[PDB]
Design a binder for these strands. Structure first.
Length: 54
DNA sequence: GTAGATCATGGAATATATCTACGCGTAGAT
């Protein structure tokens, strides 16, 4: 939330923020930076067993 | 003859980006 409230052009701390975030999301860094928004959303919804569909 | 014992005698608010001072590791010269 802080990273999304601060200026978006500001870089994010890799090991401090992104790697733990994708870790808790059960998502590889490759999947996060490579897949499009549709695939990422579908995989996130399946990972947390949500019923959403983007 | 007298004192003691005995007997009679009795109705109904938190995290984070930013600014600043300091030691200092390394760069530069020879």
């Amino acid at each position: 939330r802080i990273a999304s409230t601060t200026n978006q052009s500001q870089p994010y701390h890799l090991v401090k923020l992104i790697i733990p975030v994708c870790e808790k999301a059960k998502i590889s860094v490759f999947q996060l930076f490579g897949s499009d928004f549709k695939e990422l959303g579908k995989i996130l919804f399946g990972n947390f067993s949500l019923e959403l569909k983007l």
